[PDB]
């Protein structure tokens, strides 16, 4: 199968909502060692976000059921083991994408825009690992998520305008990392507010291609800030 066939397969699988097939096809593209187009970047990201996102959603449902269940071993055992099964799937999926990013995508990125895109992804999948990790493993995933986000953040601040959707989307997810993983609401709020303020200060730089994503992300920044500051 040549790359052109794998990409067409990924597109068909997306249309059919067969995200395992979609992710398998884009993993195969990536493992052939050549750099991705913008479209192929989005196919890879959409595929793996749907695959991991199903487990993240399932995990929250099961964890919520455990918390409403009588607190004894016979009533809790199945939910605990089932949650752990979902966690191991999530870890396998995240380890999969993180290997692709570290071995192929990041070292070979040809422009700061794609490099930031991939480092943001690396921070994301280490964040999803951190959502369910524990012990020494969690300290490692939290550290690696922070490092990838911060490196992407430094590059974006040197190379991208504050209205750039990748820079805004990075700042949004980095702020979520601070709030949800590091339990540091002050830095999270300060990062989210600054990202919004810097984009609206340079609103005249927002172009047609970016308008939809950048204004959506700006709204999510405000949505998060109201949610986060409602903990008074």
């Amino acid at each position: 199968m040549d790359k052109s066939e794998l990409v067409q397969k990924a597109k068909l699988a997306e249309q059919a909502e067969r995200y395992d097939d979609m992710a398998a096809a884009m993993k195969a593209v990536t493992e052939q060692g050549h750099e991705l187009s913008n479209e192929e970047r989005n196919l890879l990201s959409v595929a793996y976000k749907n695959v991991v996102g199903a487990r993240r959603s399932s995990w929250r449902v099961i964890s919520s059921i455990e918390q409403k269940t009588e607190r004894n071993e016979k009533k809790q055992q199945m939910g605990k083991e089932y949650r752990e099964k979902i966690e191991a799937e999530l870890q396998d999926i995240c380890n999969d994408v993180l290997e692709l990013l570290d071995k192929y995508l990041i070292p070979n990125a040809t422009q700061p825009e794609s490099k930031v895109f991939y480092l943001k992804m690396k921070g994301d999948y280490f964040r999803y690992l951190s959502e369910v990790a524990s012990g020494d493993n969690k300290q490692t995933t939290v550290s690696n998520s922070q490092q990838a986000y911060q490196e992407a953040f430094e590059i974006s601040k040197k190379e991208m305008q504050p209205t750039h959707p990748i820079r805004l989307g990075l700042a949004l997810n980095f702020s979520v990392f601070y709030y949800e993983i590091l339990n540091s609401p002050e830095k999270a709020c300060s990062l989210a507010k600054t990202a919004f303020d810097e984009a609206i200060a340079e609103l005249d730089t927002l172009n047609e291609e970016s308008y939809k994503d950048s204004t959506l992300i700006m709204q999510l920044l405000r949505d998060n800030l109201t949610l986060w500051t409602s903990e008074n």
Binding site: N50, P165, G169, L172, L216, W228
Partner: peptide
């Protein structure tokens, strides 16, 4: 349970 919102998976580049 409401959670924080994060970035969409597909971004214009």
């Amino acid at each position: 349970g409401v959670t924080s919102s994060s970035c969409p998976a597909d971004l214009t580049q």
